[PDB]
Amino acid sequence: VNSFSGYLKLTDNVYIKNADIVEEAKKVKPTVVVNAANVYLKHGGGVAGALNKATNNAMQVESDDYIATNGPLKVGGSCVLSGHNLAKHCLHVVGPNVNKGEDIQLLKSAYENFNQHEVLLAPLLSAGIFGADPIHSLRVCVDTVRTNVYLAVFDKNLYDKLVSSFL
Numbered sequence: 001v002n003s004f005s006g007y008l009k010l011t012d013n014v015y016i017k018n019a020d021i022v023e024e025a026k027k028v029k030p031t032v033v034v035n036a037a038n039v040y041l042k043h044g045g046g047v048a049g050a051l052n053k054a055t056n057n058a059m060q061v062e063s064d065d066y067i068a069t070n071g072p073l074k075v076g077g078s079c080v081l082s083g084h085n086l087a088k089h090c091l092h093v094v095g096p097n098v099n100k101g102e103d104i105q106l107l108k109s110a111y112e113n114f115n116q117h118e119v120l121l122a123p124l125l126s127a128g129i130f131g132a133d134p135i136h137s138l139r140v141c142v143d144t145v146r147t148n149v150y151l152a153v154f155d156k157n158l159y160d161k162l163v164s165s166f167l
């Protein structure tokens, strides 16, 4: 049994809810919240900008030190950093950004990072300002992630379309 409330069950392991990931993180304090990161961990906008704002920029300060030491992530890759006031850990995952021309086949590689964590609160990778089709992102999630994933969807309209169209 876990703390997550109000989710619709899509599969054995994937759950979905219309909710703000930040407000959901603040309420649940999950072991892992996933960030929709870029390779530079520059948390300017979208989910990343909202998570970072909710940490009062502490996520960005920590991320800048990580990049100064390790250099950029790979598209499809990830790193584990603090969850600050939102979660125990933040898994920063880089999905391909279609608005930069990145290979959408890298979306499966991105979701494979989730399998290293038994339970996660996450957004749909490569959705929103990363430019991918969120219906496609949900399909790759269900067909790739085997651990228990609780998906938070920003837009109510999109949430209802994802559920209604789910196979």
Ligand SMILES: O=C1CSc2cc(C(=O)O)ccc2N1
Pocket (backbone or CB within 6 Å): 020, 021, 022, 046, 047, 050, 123, 128, 129, 154
């Ligand atoms: O508070 C906010 C507004 S910014 C924001 C954007 C997104 C998104 O782009 O999916 C998700 C949650 C978000 N939380």
